[PDB]
């Protein structure tokens, strides 16, 4: 999951 990854989370604040 994207939100699981801190980078992906920080990159996609709208999705996560």
UniProtKB/Swiss-Prot annotation:
Q: Where is this region: Ser-Xaa-Pro motif, crucial for potent interaction with nAChR?
A: 4-6
Q: What is the effect of changing residue 14 to A?
A: In non-hydroxylated and non-gamma-carboxylated analog; about 3.3-fold decrease in potency of inhibition of rat alpha-9-alpha-10/CHRNA9-CHRNA10 nAChR. No change in potency of inhibition of HVA calcium channels in rat/mouse DRG neurons
Annotated phenotype, changing residue 9 to I: In non-hydroxylated and non-gamma-carboxylated analog; 1.7-fold increase in potency of inhibition of rat alpha-9-alpha-10/CHRNA9-CHRNA10 nAChR. 25-fold increase in potency of inhibition of rat alpha-3-beta-2/CHRNA3-CHRNB2 nAChR
Annotated region (Key region for inhibition of alpha-9-alpha-10/CHRNA9-CHRNA10 nAChR) at 5-7, 11-15
Q: Record's superkingdom?
A: Eukaryota
- PTM annotation: Vc1.1 is described as having no post-translational modifications (except C-terminal amidation), whereas Vc1a contains a hydroxyproline at Pro-6 and a 4-carboxyglutamate at Glu-14 (and a C-terminal amidation).
Impact reported for residue 4 to A = In non-hydroxylated and non-gamma-carboxylated analog; 2.5-fold decrease in potency of inhibition of rat alpha-9-alpha-10/CHRNA9-CHRNA10 nAChR. Decrease in potency of inhibition of HVA calcium channels in rat/mouse DRG neurons
The record's account of tissue expression is: Expressed by the venom duct.
Swapping residue 14 to K leads to an effect described as: In non-hydroxylated and non-gamma-carboxylated analog; about 3-fold decrease in potency of inhibition of rat alpha-9-alpha-10/CHRNA9-CHRNA10 nAChR. Decrease in potency of inhibition of HVA calcium channels in rat/mouse DRG neurons
What S-S linkages are listed for this chain? 2-8, 3-16
Cysteine amide-modified residues are: 16
Query: What's the impact of mutating residue 1 to A/D?
Result: In non-hydroxylated and non-gamma-carboxylated analog; no change in potency of inhibition of rat alpha-9-alpha-10/CHRNA9-CHRNA10 nAChR. No change in potency of inhibition of HVA calcium channels in rat/mouse DRG neurons
The consequence of residue 9 to G is: In non-hydroxylated and non-gamma-carboxylated analog; 1.9-fold increase in potency of inhibition of rat alpha-9-alpha-10/CHRNA9-CHRNA10 nAChR
Q: Which residues carry this modification: 4-carboxyglutamate?
A: 14
Q: What is known to happen upon mutating residue 15 to A?
A: In non-hydroxylated and non-gamma-carboxylated analog; 5-fold decrease in potency of inhibition of rat alpha-9-alpha-10/CHRNA9-CHRNA10 nAChR. No change in potency of inhibition of HVA calcium channels in rat/mouse DRG neurons
Q: Where does this polypeptide localize?
A: Secreted
Quote the annotated effect of residue 12 to A.
Answer: In non-hydroxylated and non-gamma-carboxylated analog; 10-fold decrease in potency of inhibition of rat alpha-9-alpha-10/CHRNA9-CHRNA10 nAChR. Decrease in potency of inhibition of HVA calcium channels in rat/mouse DRG neurons
Q: Which residues carry this modification: 4-hydroxyproline?
A: 6
What else does UniProt say about it? The synthetic peptide Vc1.1 (a non-hydroxylated and non-gamma-carboxylated analog of Vc1a) shows weak inhibition on nAChRs composed of alpha-3-alpha-5-beta-2/CHRNA3-CHRNA5-CHRNB2 (IC(50)=7.2 uM), alpha-3-beta-2/CHRNA3-CHRNB2 (IC(50)=5.5-7.3 uM), alpha-3-beta-4/CHRNA3-CHRNB4 (IC(50)=4.2 uM), alpha-3-alpha-5-beta-4/CHRNA3-CHRNA5-CHRNB4 (IC(50)>30 uM), alpha-4-beta-2/CHRNA4-CHRNB2 (IC(50)>30 uM), alpha-4-beta-4/CHRNA4-CHRNB4 (IC(50)>30 uM), rat alpha-7/CHRNA7 (IC(50)=7.1 uM) and alpha-1-beta-1-gamma-delta/CHRNA1-CHRNB1-CHRNG-CHRND (IC(50)>30 uM) subunits. cVc1.1 is a cyclic peptide with inhibitory activity on alpha-9-alpha-10/CHRNA9-CHRNA10 nAChRs (IC(50)=766 nM) and a high potency at inhibiting HVA calcium channels in mice DRG neurons (IC(50)=0.3 nM). Toxin cVc1.1[D11A; E14A] is a cyclic peptide with a very low inhibitory activity on alpha-9-alpha-10/CHRNA9-CHRNA10 nAChRs (IC(50)>17 uM) and a high potency at inhibiting HVA calcium channels in mice DRG neurons (IC(50)=3.3 nM). Both of them show antinociceptive actions, with greater efficacy in a model of animal chronic visceral hypersensitivity (CVH).
The similarity annotation says: Belongs to the conotoxin A superfamily.
Q: What does this protein do?
A: Alpha-conotoxins act on postsynaptic membranes, they bind to the nicotinic acetylcholine receptors (nAChR) and thus inhibit them. This toxin (native toxin Vc1a; hydroxylated and gamma-carboxylated) blocks alpha-9-alpha-10/CHRNA9-CHRNA10 nAChRs (IC(50)=62.9 nM). In contrast to the non-post-translationally modified analog Vc1.1, Vc1a does not inhibit high voltage-activated (HVA) calcium channel currents. In vivo, in contrast to Vc1.1, Vc1a does not show analgesic effects in rat models of neuropathic pain. The synthetic peptide Vc1.1 (a non-hydroxylated and non-gamma-carboxylated analog of Vc1a) has two types of targets. It blocks alpha-9-alpha-10/CHRNA9-CHRNA10 nAChRs (on rat receptors, IC(50)=19-109 nM) (with preference for rat over human receptors) and inhibits high voltage-activated (HVA) calcium channel (Cav2.2, Cav2.3) currents by acting on GABA(B) receptors (GABBR1 and GABBR2) (IC(50)=1.7 nM). It also shows moderate inhibition on alpha-6/alpha-3-beta-2-beta-3 (CHRNA6/CHRNA3-CHRNB2-CHRNB3) (IC(50)=140 nM) and alpha-6/alpha-3-beta-4 (CHRNA6/CHRNA3-CHRNB4) (IC(50)=980 nM).
Q: What is known of its domains?
A: The cysteine framework is I (CC-C-C). Alpha4/7 pattern.
Q: What is this protein called?
A: Alpha-conotoxin Vc1a
Query: Which part of the complete protein is shown?
Result: 50 to 65 of 66
